[PDB]
Subunit: 298 residues, 6 copies
């Protein structure tokens, strides 16, 4: 299926500047060339216009920092993504902090009976203004997409929820806030923390994830945060957490997903050139995209 | 069970200075705060007074360097540990070189009918003055505790042996002197070298270890030497050996032990701030203690 | 004098992508905050719109790569800069590759009888299509400003030359093409290569430079390329050359310039976040700007 | 079986200078002492004389760089190796780029009815002048030994082919040219790329490899290219590819081979001191040789 | 003159733990052997007992963190130092944060009519509770010794001030708070910031410093903070500031002081093993002490 | 004057293996191409055959390790060098440990009435079997050439001494054994240790050196040991000593020598690829040769 790339230069979901340079860092890491080689009809729809944040003290949210600008940028993204899907193309969203997942899922979910989600990440991203310890919206996209959070976030695209808890699989988690542990536990979300990855191995984790979703969804969205990889492999992220997934485990994951042919949309986020070492993180993302989209060693 | 921390600023078991700073390096890495967060009644009983070495020339044996100071400090440690156990508290000993294991086991073992031991280490520590290639007592604590070695060491606490060979499990070993291989083989001590870790995987090694001990001991003492981890993960040790256990394998091990609820005493040793990089090793030790004591990602 | 910042996201002057992210990397390194603290009336006029390059094979220049887009972007910059000067403000241009110096000098020079230039750089940037070994325009701005090169470049702003050879001082040079050595020699341009910096010392080099220009110009433009600093101090540049000026020599230079009060316009260029280590180079630039604009240790 | 070491200071199989220093870098890393310690009768037959290449423009094929010199040096190697085998000794060849495998296999194969080969490498080394993207002969030894390529290479030792496709096992591959993928696929060569190693685990890949070959060969030659290991473990190679085999996986592999007792000849190649960090790569090779030849941790 | 070493395991002058390990890190870096080699009668009087701080909320001033404990420990130090001077020995104090200078100067100054001070540091350490931006007493010792600050600090040893402004020389300064710049300016304290060191050169700064003090004091105390050196040379400090003095400049400084024979007491402070790389900073301090005490290359 | 390169793969003057790879490490760093570019008639006469060391036990002196092999290789070198000089060519010797200086000076000195020597090094190399703390001949070449030492070394080439003490200038020294300090002092050899370099500056040291020699010699031999540079700039040496000459000071020195036109022979020694980082040291040596032989930045 033809691919359409949409860059979302978003950093309002968190406080570290530079993550808005992620889309172009990845473009410069050769994302187009990489995919063209796989003989794909690849189109780059450019970047979503992101607005600026007003004085924190002058406006609305500390438990929900930059809510208006984040909700507006996400409305735009949701529309762009909805259109690509309508054109029968695969939407490949390049971030940008994880708050953009709200817009991506808003544009995709409407097109599926039961959209599944694989959240490849070191965190849960299931906080609400009530549970968030930072007020950073990039830590709330999954919860918001499940229909939990501020209506400005849960209603993007004009509907909610975008997905169901039983159709979500978290992989690589190693940092959850107490409220999130409760959320995950209570909503019954399938989660493979680093304990399970270490204990079962990435092959088994992926086999189970693929079988679980394939068995109950009609589409699967891959939401990959580079912080899911160990900081030694992906240093250019704002919220690094040691003891993460390796470069190889990640390529294996992408290769098994490609093999399964279940991924119908994807986004690579949190690439921050300014916290990186010579674009290493953007390069890992592009390599991972190569695997996801069909590259084979043999 | 409430925890009592006992620091043992010992460096007389070997020749590299600085390992006596281990206890405070770990305190500075936040060992108390870390454990308090797990809702533990944690108490820090301070440090065991360690004496200074006698004239190297007038000293008893080059095969048993600093024997008297080491045996004396170990008598004190054994008494302090014995008391904690008698008070119904879990003794958490922070070293200090591995020779302090002699004192820790002397204070604990008397309270169990069949105390088991998990020796997480890159070496065997089962040398005697006859087999030791260095004369360093930190390479003899396991043998001494099994009743093999100089009486000044084997009789600490007034009894011997502290444990039986069939109740010991070595994990992560990758450097054994010939006499130690003979000792292990002949005493029939269960051992998982890096070959078995690489071949079987940490999960299986831990499962087997836990089941083996759970099946025949009434208490288990964890004796963890930071040199058991790869020098890239724990550079601050006096006897580093490449090709070691990773950060994740070590957390998995601690998590599986926590889950099993078999650890009744523990000690983290050989942290040397002076051979380290910004307290990285003390930090790893504290993180490992967090997993051992119940932290869960989910 | 009030400062007006103009970002020029230019990378068409050379081939390494990412240098177009320099303006924002510096903004993120805190350029505004830094200058505001010096109690300056600082204004950020945003970025100059840069056009895209057409197929190399489809258009005009290999000895003059991206000539049209480079000349057009420079016309825009020249206008923006001209306006700031007319408003009686100091133009502070943030790049972007060095080809933007063509536009900056085009906007400034018209306002001075004898504008002097200090070219802080590892190279000479005095090539023409005839002498250029790469066809990269970022290696021709000085020559073009002196009136030597393609008319599309020498006539920006509608006049030429912008400056005279006798009013130019090169500092930190350690890589000159043969044609450039001839150019410098023949035009009689004052140059302090690393040999002179090593031999005389930065204090003497700066004293002489300041006295030389102060004695014959009515304004001095500082054109600072980060590659002038050693790659160990400023790794984020496309054309690094070892054995460069140190962090301290650079701050000394800026401090002596501030003291002299001869700098009437300035530009910091070649900052490339994508070839950098955690924004180190953008940070050095901002620190250097702090010194240039008056910061004092005492 | 006694061992005879043969150094082959070859760099003509590729373009990076320095790989000719590999034999001595390994000698300096202690290859002799390491093996003597295992109680081996070890003999160092010195180095095979390598000639200098003729003028490239006067050379016969650009798709076959340095063909004459490489074929010549290979004839000499084949003779020396043939002799060692005839003397009832194990030939241990130290390189030198991988093109020397042509000579090693030429001297060995003639002595076996069905010689098996384990190609521990990141590449396939199955190119021909037609498929080679570089013209570097170090990327053609496996194909040449299988009887595919220039006769100057396929006829070394006066016979062909040296081995059959069904007796070859590639391990650690992560970089194959299209022509090579077709070659491997069509010749039906057993291959375990990083996908399989990641998916199945080294233990299983080795068990299967050993069982497969043991079941159909009368001798097995190990041709180990240090680039098979991750560049972080073995940086001193001319063709590094990230996402490689770890230090531990490699020792496990060697240990399982030693255990199986199937290796009848071996060669360690591509060590380049000039692209290395303090002889790290030569040291790894020597340590792997120690495992291959019988070292045991327990 | 015989030397008496006094360790002061102090970290209460600031907030980073570990600087209390400085005295022993330097002992382990070989301070005694180094000095014995210079044929000195060296004596190690051990460490000054430091108390623990009282509850912050129950403390008297947040602008003066740990005031009681710091003042107490300083009284003890002053007494020990006073005693060494009375015995006709040179007091060599090892820290420990810079707040200990209050105690060192208190024990020394009383023995001189006009004690001079050389403050080798990146900061001024001339803050008061009013000007301090942190409330950390390690940033107030110079002012306190000059008689400016809380009486608990200014009256240590029972007298004040210990020294006069005209007898103080600051070298290597590159970080002064506004209040401190005003203080230095108004008290007329001689200061050589990095600008002067860069501009004049270390040789000239030292010649002038030595001549200035030699001309008006009857004793000179060297108070050397390792943060005065660049963080690349001395990473183990709590308040690092880039663009510092080099390893060579520091040895030159010590060598010129030794040559001048004006140093009558000294202290090396802020060494923090826990923020260091393999005891590098403690080693630098010891090497500098070797130069200060007479080592000569020729 | 045409240049003739003579490689001397010598490591018998010391104990660390690998320095014998120095000549080719430098050839691989492009020494020929570098000099050809300067329009030199450059000829590479290959390498001097070096013999293997005798049984350590049956060897002549532990105070003169490998004396016979070292003296023999030096006889050969002296002859090869003597010939080059007789052919009117400049002898450029590449080492190899510093003991080869004995042979280089033996072949050159006979052709001058008063040959001067510039010993660019971190050590003095003026030990004898009596003063040597190691027995390593690479620490005795200067003394031997001055006629002090074992006759097997002092009589190479059949005459002695090769040079006079008043015609020698040591630069960069920072490590002298006591006997060497006495030797230097008593023979009245001109020496600029790091103290003088730090105090006077490289420019002044070079000016003085050049004038001193120019005023009394008819030829000057440059004997440059890479250990003269700081280990951070030249890590690939067997006897590194911190606090050395920088990359720039070394280029300045070479440039001033080139300018003076006094160097009539030269040798670059102690490059050890095996203790280096990606051939960095050989690269520095080649760059230095480029400056020595006339390269100019301007
Ligand atoms: N997309 C991310 N990087 N999320 C990190 C979230 C961290 C933390 N749970 C928070 O809510 O602040
Ligand atoms: N299997 C693992 N890698 N576990 C990591 C656990 C780390 C630590 N105990 C935490 O809770 O953050
Ligand atoms: N606890 C330790 N670090 N032990 C290291 C022992 C090393 C060696 N086996 C010895 O006996 O000397
Ligand atoms: N499975 C492993 N990691 N084995 C490591 C063995 C290394 C080497 N053969 C030794 O005996 O030291
Ligand atoms: N602004 C620059 N970085 N210029 C580098 C120019 C390098 C070289 N002289 C060229 O013309 O290609
Ligand atoms: N004084 C200096 N740093 N000179 C550097 C010269 C480097 C080299 N000879 C060149 O021409 O590029
Ligand atoms: N032995 C090697 N390093 N081979 C690398 C081969 C790389 C590539 N397949 C080629 O044929 O050029
Ligand atoms: N299992 C793995 N590690 N696979 C790595 C594949 C990397 C990438 N897709 C390639 O073809 O180069
Ligand atoms: N001894 C020191 N490290 N002093 C640092 C002082 C920093 C700052 N001027 C303060 O008063 O907080
Ligand atoms: N000569 C120097 N190195 N000056 C450094 C000054 C740095 C900067 N202007 C500051 O005030 O922090
Ligand atoms: N060329 C050298 N690297 N010489 C080092 C000499 C070191 C010491 N002075 C010795 O005589 O052993
Ligand atoms: N000016 C210098 N850099 N001197 C370095 C001297 C270092 C030390 N005192 C020694 O004798 O080794
Ligand atoms: Mn996320
Ligand atoms: Mn141990
Ligand atoms: Mn430039
Ligand atoms: Mn290969
Ligand atoms: Mn201070
Ligand atoms: Mn030397």
């Amino acid at each position: 299926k033809p691919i359409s790339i949409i860059g979302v230069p978003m950093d309002l979901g968190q406080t570290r500047r530079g993550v808005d340079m992620g889309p172009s860092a990845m473009r410069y890491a050769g994302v187009i060339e990489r995919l063209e080689r796989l003989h794909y009809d690849i189109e780059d729809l450019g970047d979503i216009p992101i607005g600026k944040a007003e004085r924190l003290h002058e406006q609305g949210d500390s438990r929900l920092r930059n809510l208006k600008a984040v909700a507006e940028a996400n409305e735009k993204l949701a529309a762009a993504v909805d259109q690509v899907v309508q054109r029968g193309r695969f939407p490949l969203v390049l971030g940008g902090d994880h708050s953009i997942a709200i817009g991506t899922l808003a544009g995709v979910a409407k097109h599926y009976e039961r959209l599944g989600v694989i959240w490849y990440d070191a965190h849960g991203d299931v906080n609400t203004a009530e549970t968030s310890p930072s007020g950073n919206i990039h830590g709330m996209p999954l919860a918001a997409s499940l229909g939990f959070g501020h209506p400005a976030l849960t209603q993007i695209g004009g509907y909610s929820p975008k997905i169901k808890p039983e159709h979500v699989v978290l992989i690589g988690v190693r940092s959850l806030d107490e409220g999130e542990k409760k959320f995950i536990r209570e909503k019954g979300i399938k989660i493979y923390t680093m304990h399970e990855v270490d204990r079962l191995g990435m092959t088994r984790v992926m086999e189970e994830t693929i079988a679980y979703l394939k068995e109950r969804t009609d589409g699967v969205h891959l939401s990959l945060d580079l912080d899911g990889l160990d900081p030694s492999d992906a240093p250019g992220v704002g919220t690094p957490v040691i003891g993460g997934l390796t470069y190889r485990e990640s390529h294996l994951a992408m290769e098994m997903l490609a093999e399964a042919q279940i991924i119908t949309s994807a986004e690579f986020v949190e690439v921050n050139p300014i916290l990186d070492e010579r674009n290493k993180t953007a390069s890992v993302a592009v390599a991972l995209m190569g695997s996801l989209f069909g590259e084979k060693l043999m």
